[model samples]
Every structure is written in C-alpha cells, then in structure tokens.
Target chain A: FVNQYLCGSHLVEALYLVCGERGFFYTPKT
Target chain B: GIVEQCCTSICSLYQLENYCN
Candidate 1:
C-alpha cells in the first residue's frame, strides 16, 4: 500500500527541496 | 508556475491526509 505514513511527510519535504519550487511538474507522477 | 502550485497542493493534501520524492 506504499505505507505513506512511513515517509509521506519526508517525501513531500524532499520534493520541495529537490524540485526547487518549480520542478515537480517535470515529475513523472504529475 | 505549475510546479509551484503542484507543490502547494501536495503540501495541503499531505497535511490534510498527511511528502514527495
């Protein structure tokens, strides 16, 4: 089930940092 | 800035449900 609770928060933060406020759109999930 | 919006949305959803990679 992905166990979001285990890393959901972390993932979000990482994305923000790595994505640089405007890179998630390039993400495959999007 | 679609990505900006996307991140904002994710944060809201994450907090509501409460990440990314």
Candidate 2:
C-alpha cells in the first residue's frame, strides 16, 4: 500500500493523506 | 508513485539582499 504522502498546499494535502498525524494542526481559528 | 513539486514562496520577498557589512 504505497499511498502515504502529506505536505500542504492542495487543501492541506488531502487532509494529510487521510489523517495520520493526529489533530493535524486544526486550522479553524479565523 | 511519483510526486514532484517545488515552490519556496520567496520569488520576491523584497529582493532579499543582505550583504555582510
């Protein structure tokens, strides 16, 4: 299963490749 | 699997020039 890549730019890189980095820097403080 | 991208977002950060004075 070679499907794990997360960076940021395209909608937070698809939610960090299907969520895998916990909380994932919850960005909603606007 | 192929992924390639590069864009440091500093194309013109005010010319970014700093010489040791």
Candidate 3:
C-alpha cells in the first residue's frame, strides 16, 4: 500500500537523521 | 489500517531502542 511507503519513508528519513547524528550520514540509495 | 499502523508501531518499538550510538 501507498501508506506503507509513506510511513516508512518518513520513519526511514528520521532514522537517517539519527544515523547522521552519530556520524553515519548518507543518503539512502533505495 | 492494520499493516500500516501495526507495522509502524512495531517498527518503532524495535527501532526506537536500536539506533546510532
């Protein structure tokens, strides 16, 4: 469903930010 | 709404603790 992508994307982005906080910054390729 | 909400909540429960440190 589209909502899965929508929700996951938001969560994933937040997770990405958290990663950046710990010096693991990088863009998701997928 | 089951999968969208359920999975998200569960994802949070697990992912919330496991993160960059």
Candidate 4:
C-alpha cells in the first residue's frame, strides 16, 4: 500500500509502487 | 462502523489491488 504515503519526500510521488496477484484468482485455462 | 456490506467492489478492488506493498 502507499508505503506510508510514498512521500518520504525529497522528491514526489516517485512511482514507488508494488503489486501481486496472490496465487491467481478462480476459473481455468484451457 | 458498519462492516456488513460484504465489501462487494471485489473487496474494494482487492484492497486496491494488493496496495503497493
């Protein structure tokens, strides 16, 4: 999440981000 | 403090899509 607002700033909004899908959602792949 | 809506916006976008962790 925002990593403490991602604004420990000497800069701004640094695009400092992260993500994941957490073992994939439901449904199937054929 | 109501938490019974079942958070149906796909659990609020799955907590903002795993939220920049």
Could you say which candidate leads in DockQ? 3
Chain A, candidate 3, TM-score of 0.42
Q: In terms of lDDT, which candidate is stronger, 1 or 4?
A: 1
DockQ of each: 0.05, 0.03, 0.19, 0.08
Error of 4 at A13 (Å): 30
| Count of residue pairs whose backbone atoms collide, per candidate | 6, 0, 0, 2
lDDT for model 4 comes to 0.26
Give one digit per residue, the lDDT tens place, for model 2 in A1-27: 332233224434444554444524423
Between candidates 2 and 4, the one scoring higher on DockQ is 4
lDDT minimum window of 10 residues, candidate 3 chain A:
A21-30
Looking at candidate 1, what is the lDDT of residue B13? 62
What TM-score would every model get versus the actual structure?
0.35, 0.19, 0.39, 0.14
Give the range of the ten consecutive residues with the poorest summed lDDT in model 2 chain A: A2-11
Residues A1-30 of candidate 4: C-alpha lDDT, one tens digit per residue: 653222232111221221342332221122
Which prediction has more favorable TM-score, 1 or 4?
1
**With candidate 2 superimposed using the best TM-score fit, by how many Å does residue A4's alpha carbon deviate from the native?**
23
Candidate 3 residue lDDT tens string, A1-30: 576656555655665665565643323333
lDDT, candidate 1, B1-21, per-residue tens: 534544434435654342334
Model 2 ranges off by over 4 Å = A1-8, A26-30, B1-6, B9-21
Q: What is the lDDT of residue A13 in candidate 4?
A: 20
Best by lDDT: 1
The chain A TM-scores for the candidates, taken one by one, are 0.48, 0.20, 0.42, 0.13
lDDT at position B11, candidate 3: 57
Using DockQ, rank the candidates from best to worst: 3, 4, 1, 2
Candidates arranged by TM-score, highest first: 3, 1, 2, 4
